[model samples]
Target chain A: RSGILVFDVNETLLDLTSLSPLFERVFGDAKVLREWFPELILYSQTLTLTGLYRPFGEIAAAVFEMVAANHQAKVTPDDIAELKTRLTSMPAYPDVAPALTRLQDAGFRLVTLTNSAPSPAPSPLEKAGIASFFEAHLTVHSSQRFKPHPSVYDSTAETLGAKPEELCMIACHIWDTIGAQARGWRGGFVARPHNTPLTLAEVPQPDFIGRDMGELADQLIASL
Target chain B: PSRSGILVFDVNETLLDLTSLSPLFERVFGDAKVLREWFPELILYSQTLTLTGLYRPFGEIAAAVFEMVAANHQAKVTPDDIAELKTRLTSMPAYPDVAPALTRLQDAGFRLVTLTNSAPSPAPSPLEKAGIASFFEAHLTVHSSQRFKPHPSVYDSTAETLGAKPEELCMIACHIWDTIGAQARGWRGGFVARPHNTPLTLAEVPQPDFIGRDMGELADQLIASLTA
Candidate 1:
């Protein structure tokens, strides 16, 4: 079993649903959040694949503007500022802190892997009050690439001083896990309401699937 | 021209217009813009599959993305809806300038061909249905290499299959990723800057050689460059 678990930071740990009110106020539909997020990830990967290195934060803001333009919705500077503030200020999912604690206590080494750039300001994990649980905070900045790039996964394994097979990726997005698993790392899927494991004959499936962090931690602990 | 004049074009929104599928999105998702939303999602997954050592025909990915986006909105999508999408995608009309531009390139002695991410088809293929199939010498698909575009192998293999060097081939597409990918693989890139697609201007990225608002303008510029 892989004793080292690397978790994805955004929806995997932090509660993105908490940002819905800000989205609703700006776009007049809370559901636009769902549309905005995936497109954000899509653009991040697009930039990375083409070697166009915009920081993840810049990509996020740019994507928001694109979505606003598409919908003919007017957005202001303060609205974007509020979005940045709200993004970093999201709370962790209720199950996250407890499950991370349980995993850490079970001799598993926990770490965070995020696309967000390192900041002088408080990190999302720190803002969510769960920064101490992770052994280290790793970011895509080191590789200048986003998730699902083989280089990002390999860079993670190198930074942690672990073999590729010795580390497992814990993420809510299938693309994140697929990237890691392709590089010899194990995968655990956290199936949030808007995300799930893609059942395709071609891609490697996640080793474990859980509806929430608590259930996933339970499975990880029982396996030990 | 530096060498041989082989022009490789990207299909889909580059040559064929994607707006024909807007009606289907309106019928299914209650919004026409869902087509805009679905396309990049489809591309994101396709590239993800390639980066992660997976392969699926573009048709399969299209259906999968439709259902995924529909699920996000809690909209119920039917199998019939997916079938209609396939029909629309295959029969989408070529942009008004496409045929004229291809005719100009062909008349100028450039060897025009297509390299699409869509699956290979027999008679009455998507290109055929678009009424511009005869403009090209061959229609290549990523299925041959089992990898999507932006992967070096797809471009390299296409060059090899056409019996030309990478430097001799020019890739024309509406998408920045395709242009960048071709440039990265030592091929020339001509970008047709369709309304929905823009030229990527990130400092470190490889810029396309030609940027035009439509295919006719791009083709004219390309002919000037190659013949001058």
Candidate 2:
């Protein structure tokens, strides 16, 4: 049976390349963007493991501050404000809109999940013009736990009124897939450029693997 | 009489001076600061594997992460570069305070051991290479448990192997992630606030029972609390 698809919002659907110019301006090199994102994820996970909670935006800015300090670069308050602005405004990948349309047209129920706190009336997805594709938008703020934490996945399944097996997480991140699969959900790996599935024998491999959302949507539709 | 049954030490950065690897990163990345980036990437990936119900040796992850970081920066890395990292990683000397504090704990009737994510090596192991192997009653690795630190399974296996209750063990480390895991399992926690490693001050998370600038200070607190 085709299961409900839960999507990871940031890099999975969004094109974070939009933030490169800001990172270039702030850090003098656009590549520092790669270095900064993982640290933000790490810091968020660390806080979650320690039984602490900081909003995703707060952690992102804090990580930005640390990155600047590491490079001995000076960052102004305006820079932080700009970071928050750019983060919530990342455009969805060109492939993402068509993929969602195909999945929805195939009668798949779609839901979104993110570590980010829910934005105001016009959410990030709404701003990106794809909010209507999902039936629900879930966030770690509701669960107060970050990804790869079993609770976050558990809560998502519960909120969707679906059993763990009735859900499949689609994401570009190996860690996110690992988390979802660990909680009994199926994993769909979107091997976006600069990201790939970690094919270790010991790890739970993704049930569906595709290079981008278009291929992933085709696989899901065909599998159904 | 003792407050806790065994004192479990974390090897890298906790007892060993992880700074020794800075020069290697400098050579490879041309920026010693890359070590900071590389270290967190290694940790993030290690826990990634653990949470995913996967098992990989820490050394393997370390080398893989090093190569990944190199690739990210568009730097070239040779096999020899990896070989040097292994050599530096496993042979880093213990912090100066490590020996004196470990000696103090051993003399004061504390049974000390190491719980590391690093696998057991055939060559002189990290502890032996660091010259503190004799101070530990047992040197344990995640290989036995098949998972990395901060995973409940790893802590559970460590407690089982030592034949001690969770409450009877105390984990000391420079990394909050390790200590937080131990405390979650009911083991006591001691944090060594080394450079760049500070205890998280949050109302929700239980603070480490002992906080020290270095091992000597941590040992002093342990001596005062447990040797009554």
Candidate 3:
């Protein structure tokens, strides 16, 4: 529980609900964003496996186009640009800030792994005002592959100068748990309804399963 | 004008021409893109399986993903839907353009072979029925490796079994997983980029030595490059 804390940025901390409005304007259906998100993750992982060395943001752009087409609506470059701006500005979940502060004050190395690209203005953590909480930033944009691809996880260890087993990966996706942990990284599942552990992820079960960051922090700090 | 090296064909869309399967998908999902999305999404998770030390054949994964996706979207994938899906995958109407271009490549002395990630022991039945199997010297599968394409080892083992170094073999496919894996393993690749199957715009992955709109167009360019 006391290993290098590598947090997942998107759903783990920040609220992506604000960005669904962009889907509304583009497809006239806000729920379309919900449906599109799983497909987006699916295809981004597809590209990573296919050996596409492109940024996750680039894949996001293409997936938006395809997801739009799936809904019979066409997305434009201007729309993709607008979505990018909104995505980087999303606010963190209320409990996120306090838990991050508690963990950092207790002296654990903290970093973020995002499937999105680095923001053009300020990084998402900086924009979220949690910049002080993290010592490093890594994105699928940096690794040129999406999360749970092993290389993307190993990359964090490579750049941060830690061994894979010396790191802990916390995320909402069971794939992240299985992939990272299978490579010797400790895994935490943010199990709140939608992000429950997949019964047969084919890796040993995760070390921690918490509903919120504070709950996880309690388990994390106590175990150390 | 010959696209150099021995050409390894990916059977699904690259050679067997399964355009006939689209309607069954449209019947189930009410969109053409659903079919397009399912196979890759299946491979998407299947790749994760390999990374997690799990193994499942491409066809078993295909049917399971089909049913799961249909359920996820609240649609009913009937027995007939799957019946037709497997049937159409195994047997398909020929692409009139693909046949002649394949013949041209064969006549030009390019050694063509088929490598697929599908199940069903020896994948030659579909190719032989499609009448394109005669052009190939061998048919191969990732089932033997217990891992799918893009894993690198599949291509490495295939090239070794065929008595050719990787550089002497070229992977030709509509699937980037097959092509990029081969390219990453030091084999050449020719990508068939269509409105449906576009190449990812990534610089770290090498630009394929050849790119074409379809089997006929890709084969013609490859054949021309060699014969010219």
Candidate 4:
């Protein structure tokens, strides 16, 4: 098992199901979030693959609008504002804190890598109250590249003075896991409902996977 | 009219049939579309590696992506399964008209080459075993560029290697991004819309120069346009 566990903030450790209802009001189908999420990730990687740069928020806005438009619905500025507001107050999975305490108490160093825009100081991780759980928080904004990109993954390894083999991504997104694995790091899946790994992206094997962080962290701790 | 000096092709479904792997994916994942979903994901990340200043052979990425897909599905896959799946690449035959269409162009004074995100190393390329390797002057993989196509560097580098300007080169690919990459660098392209593939409708993205239903039709269009 990789030593230092790098976690993805959203969906993996946080309950982002809060955004589904927002899309339901817009597209008349909460399931649209499923399609929209993969699209957002696909296009973000597509833009990155093509050498284009845009922050994760801008891409999220465009993607929400794109999916809404495809459904023949209009997305108002208020909807986008509401989505941003929801992110600030997202609750961590009930299992997250206890597991973080377990892994941290178990003496494994914890860090974070996210595509979310960075806060000047009080970051989303801080707002979510999981700030103290990490040694330091990292963002794609600083790298100007999103997750699944090599630079974002490699920079973390550099900043920590660790080999990729010593890194593991605890992420719910298949793309994020593949991204970390691409850097020679291992990955864990917090397979929440609606957060199943995408069959489209390939990885070596699952280092850990479970219904929540509690179960996943137990296995990860023991394996390490 | 788009100038076409040397025509470069994207391998893996543009000429060679990747559908051959569907049965293997089906055997392993119980769904043939697994190959369909896995390939684009593999290629997308290949570009990310390059764009992110990371590099790996396309084959390594291919194997890695396969492993990810297997884990995601909770499928019990083995090295044998991967070994079996990878063989599909080497054993893949070309599109029915790929041979004659390429021959026609070769006779008409057009030079041909292949440019792919995949490499031709650590093992012989499918292009060689598929019998299509003889049809081109070069089989170029993006591993050398440390980037995949759709990046200006891969296209520009490919054209430069051919001793031609970007304008004098045309890229033909089933994937619109490949077409757009060449187009972005002042090169033109042909779109081969095989099944499960189509043009992307990004409002800001430009349309490809030639849209064809198959490689044979694309071949004829290229010869007609370039010769005239």
Candidate 2 lDDT at B123 equals 68
Ten-residue stretch with the least lDDT total in model 3 chain B: B194-203
lDDT per residue (tens digit) for residues B68-155 in model 2: 6787666899999999999998898888899889888988888899999899889688888888889988888889777777777778
What residue pairs are clashing in model 1? Answer: none
DockQ (CA atoms), all models: 0.43, 0.30, 0.25, 0.17
- Error at A162, model 2, angstroms: 5.4
For model 4, the DockQ equals 0.17
Judge candidate 4 against the unseen true structure and give its global Cα lDDT, from 0 to 1.
Answer: 0.75
Candidate 3 lDDT for residue A169: 90
Q: Which stretches of candidate 1 lie over 4 Å from their true place?
A: A17-36, A47-54, A61-87, A161-166, B1-4, B165-167, B223-228
> For model 3, how does the per-residue alpha-carbon lDDT over A1-224 read when each residue is reduced to its tens digit?
34799888877777777787898899896756655666567656656665665666666676677566546687677998997777667888888988888888778889888777775657777788887788777777767777777777777789888998678898876677777897898887775333544333233678887788899888888878
> How would you order the candidates by lDDT, starting with the best?
1, 2, 4, 3
Task: Give all candidate RMSDs, comma-separated.
Answer: 3.1, 4.0, 5.0, 6.3
Judged by DockQ relative to the true structure, which candidate is superior, 1 or 3?
A: 1
Tens digits of lDDT, candidate 3, B82-101: 77777777886556667787
Sorted by DockQ (best first), the order is: 1, 2, 3, 4
What tens-digit string does per-residue lDDT give for candidate 2 at A1-224?
Answer: 35799999888888888889988998888877877887778767766655668788887887788677667689899998999888988899999989988888898899998989976777778889999999899998977878888888999888878998789999988789989999899999998655655544466779999988999998989987
For candidate 1 chain A, the 10 contiguous residues with the lowest summed lDDT are A193-202
- Per-residue lDDT of candidate 4, residues B43-158 (tens digit): 65565565545676676777776776577567888989888877776678788878888898788778799998776665457777778888889878777667766667888788
Return the top candidate by DockQ. 1
- Candidate 4: clashing pairs of residues: A202-B65, A202-B68, A202-B69, A203-B68
- Candidates 1 and 3: which is better by TM-score? 1
